[PDB]
Design a protein around this ligand. Structure first.
Ligand SMILES: Cc1ccc2ncnc(N)c2c1
Length: 283
């Protein structure tokens, strides 16, 4: 027992669950997706982030409602979550991993260039544009995101009264974005092999110890099917030291991403999505 706000009902007809619901914009009769966040500062920042961003591999906000709960209107993603393509040891073919990963890299590079760190990249936050395996992907869930300081201002003065831990923190400052590159490394491992790199399944070593040591579970039988280049990129993103860890630029320059065929398929999917909204141009 509950109702939708009158302002939402005015513009949309709510439907099935995908908290995410299928809805229809009355004006166009087009399918939309409505994210319902229960009841503030994280939602306002998320909306502000979503509105400012403009990239084909990042979800766009269509509308927003601040009522009994928060209602976020987004583009519908027919393919659903990437999670559903990797769940229960299901694995994607290398070429599919590459097409998807390239887009995730472009999306995360864009975020980083724009002073945004996602902080929660997972297969459940990566959505697919269609039920076809060759599709566009979009990064979602900016609820844990951070905007890129008090350290810089502190450094301007004389450190007469400054604590040693603050001066020691100068070595590693400005490397928070590297958390996204680690997550991408974990996502890539899962896509390639169908299993997680770090887990509490059939092991004595604790999840914390596996992650800090950077000793992922390597199953040769599973990995033999995967190329040496794809595994080399995983290895370079799964680096413990955030200062040594591969950035989005380094990952995009890696030999595994140097595939003209995959890049062509991406641009082809791009023009296909844009064709419906393309306005005549000055020749
Ligand atoms: C965040 C968001 C946006 C669009 C979606 N479209 C389909 N299925 C989902 N689970 C979706 C989630």
């Amino acid at each position: 027992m509950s109702v939708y706000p009158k302002a939402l009902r005015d513009e949309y007809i709510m439907s099935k669950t995908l908290e995410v619901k299928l809805a229809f914009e009355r004006k166009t009769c087009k399918k939309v997706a409505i994210k319902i966040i229960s009841k503030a500062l994280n939602v306002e920042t998320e909306i502000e982030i979503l509105k400012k961003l403009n990239h084909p591999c990042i979800i766009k906000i269509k509308n927003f409602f601040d009522a009994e709960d928060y209602y976020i209107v987004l583009e519908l993603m027919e393919g659903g979550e990437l999670f559903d393509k990797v769940v229960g040891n299901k694995r994607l073919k290398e070429a599919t991993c590459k097409l998807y990963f390239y887009q995730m890299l472009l999306a995360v590079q864009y975020l980083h260039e724009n002073g945004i760190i996602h902080r929660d990249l997972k297969p459940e936050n990566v959505l697919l544009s269609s039920q076809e395996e060759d599709c566009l992907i979009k990064i979602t869930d900016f609820g844990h995101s951070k905007i890129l300081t008090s350290l810089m201002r502190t450094l301007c003065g004389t450190p007469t009264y400054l604590a040693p831990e603050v001066l020691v923190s100068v070595g590693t400052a400005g490397y928070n974005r590297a958390v996204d590159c680690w997550s991408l490394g974990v996502i890539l491992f899962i896509c390639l092999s169908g299993y997680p790199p770090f887990s509490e399944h059939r092991t004595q070593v604790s999840l914390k110890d596996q992650i800090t040591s950077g000793k992922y579970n390597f199953i040769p039988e599973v990995w033999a099917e995967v190329s040496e280049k794809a595994l080399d990129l995983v290895k370079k993103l799964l680096v413990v030291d955030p200062k040594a860890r591969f950035t989005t630029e380094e990952a995009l320059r890696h030999p595994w991403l140097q595939d003209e065929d995959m890049k062509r398929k991406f641009q082809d999917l791009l023009s296909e999505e844009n064709e419906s909204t393309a306005l005549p141009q000055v020749l």
